[PDB]
Design a protein around this ligand. Structure first.
Ligand SMILES: OC[C@H]1O[C@H](O[C@H]2[C@H](O)[C@@H](O)[C@@H](O[C@H]3[C@H](O)[C@@H](O)[C@@H](O)O[C@@H]3CO)O[C@@H]2CO)[C@H](O)[C@@H](O)[C@@H]1O
Length: 374
């Protein structure tokens, strides 16, 4: 009786994983099923389903999930394998928690300025320049083209401002992250969110702006500049957008934006009776040089396998995202990170809708996070 491996992933990885699964099935007789799940729903769907025996055998996603999923006993440790040496230790460590490896990374990433060269032949070097350019575009195209869009109320996208000015999630110490020392309402975090509010107040961003508006408008030729990640580029290229990638403009002279750095990878369900076969699929096939490069070609980010990064290092997009990631900060993978996102998103929603001062919203966010952690 042929066994089956089911994979959950975002829309970006489906086609390539589907094809690779078909190849694995032809060779080995193992059925492979690739199921789209919206990225924002994967971890919660898995937290719910895995204990009920209805979780996928493999899930694809971001390394910040690892602590939460590892402490809850839902993802399987990955034993050593022949290709381990071929992956950057930084990417492996992102997928490691409590001394064990919990995923096979395929790429790293950070958000950056993506710009449509039809509207902005040369990208802005500072946020002040970006603001002027966006206002010009907004006036000149009289509403049909947005000067600038990002997900205005989503912490992940506003983090580069927060971190740029010296905010932090959990204090980095020589003994590790201090989850009792939260920096998301410190003076730097306030200054970063005040920059967000400035963008809204100057009419550059709208309170309703979110990921879908950003992504669709840019893909459809109706946005000059956005702050988004490498996951979005292939769709833009396929839609015929003449785009470039550059670091987010410096917040002020000599003060760079500092985005989150993420690592994307494959994780195995510890409750799955196919976990051994899932691990084999990942280490013996997914992890190989050609397979990792083919994943890049289907979903181009920053490859985590060293000899694959070497193949793409001169792609202008890789160059741009790399320059952005160089000023960035890896997301924590500790379980407590789960408590951060909703509180901060809610704070930023209050700010961009003029419901609270930056100081009040962020101070309350931090109180909420601490209570949840404790
Ligand atoms: O906002 C909370 C959220 O932040 C982090 O999620 C970000 C991802 O790490 C990042 O990759 C990007 O997600 C994209 C997927 O990679 C891509 O395949 C496709 O599905 O589009 C996604 C963007 O819509 O952006 C998200 C932030 O939206 C963190 O990893 C999450 O755990 C956290 O919940």
């Amino acid at each position: 009786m042929q066994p089956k491996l089911t994979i959950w992933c975002s829309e970006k990885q489906v086609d390539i994983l589907q094809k690779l699964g078909e190849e694995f099935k032809a060779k080995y007789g193992v059925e492979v099923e690739v199921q789209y799940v919206n990225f924002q729903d994967i971890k919660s769907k898995f937290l719910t389903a895995a204990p009920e025996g209805q979780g996928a055998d493999i899930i694809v996603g971001a390394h910040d999930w690892v602590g939460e999923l590892a402490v809850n006993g839902l993802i399987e440790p990955i034993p050593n394998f022949s290709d381990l040496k071929n992956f950057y230790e930084t990417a492996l460590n992102a997928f490691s928690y409590g001394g064990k490896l919990y995923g096979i990374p395929y790429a790293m990433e950070a958000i950056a300025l993506i710009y449509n060269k039809d509207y902005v032949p040369e990208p802005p070097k500072t946020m002040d320049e970006l603001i002027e350019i966006a206002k010009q575009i907004d006036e000149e195209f009289g509403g049909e083209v947005r000067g600038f869009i990002t997900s205005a109320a989503e912490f992940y996208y506003i983090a580069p401002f927060i971190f740029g000015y010296g905010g932090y999630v959990f204090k980095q110490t020589e003994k590790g992250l201090d989850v009792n020392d939260i920096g998301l309402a410190n003076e730097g975090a306030i200054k970063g969110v005040k920059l967000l509010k400035r963008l809204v107040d100057e009419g550059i961003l709208d309170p309703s702006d979110n990921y879908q508006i950003m992504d669709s408008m840019f893909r459809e030729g109706q946005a000059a500049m956005i702050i988004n990640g490498p996951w979005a580029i292939k769709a833009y290229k396929d839609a015929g957008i003449d785009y470039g990638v550059a670091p987010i403009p410096d917040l002020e002279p000599g003060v760079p934006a500092r985005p989150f750095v993420g690592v994307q990878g494959f994780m195995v369900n510890a409750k799955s009776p196919n976990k051994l076969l899932a691990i084999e699929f990942l280490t013996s096939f997914i992890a190989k040089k050609e397979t990792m490069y083919r994943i890049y070609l289907g979903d181009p980010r920053l490859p985590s396998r060293k000899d694959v990064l070497e193949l793409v290092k001169d792609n202008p997009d890789v160059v741009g995202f790399t320059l952005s990631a160089a000023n960035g900060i890896p997301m924590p993978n500790v379980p407590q990170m789960a408590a951060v996102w909703a509180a901060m998103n809610d704070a930023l929603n209050l700010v961009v809708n003029g419901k609270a001062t930056v100081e009040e919203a962020l101070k309350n966010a931090v109180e909420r996070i601490k209570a949840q952690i404790q």
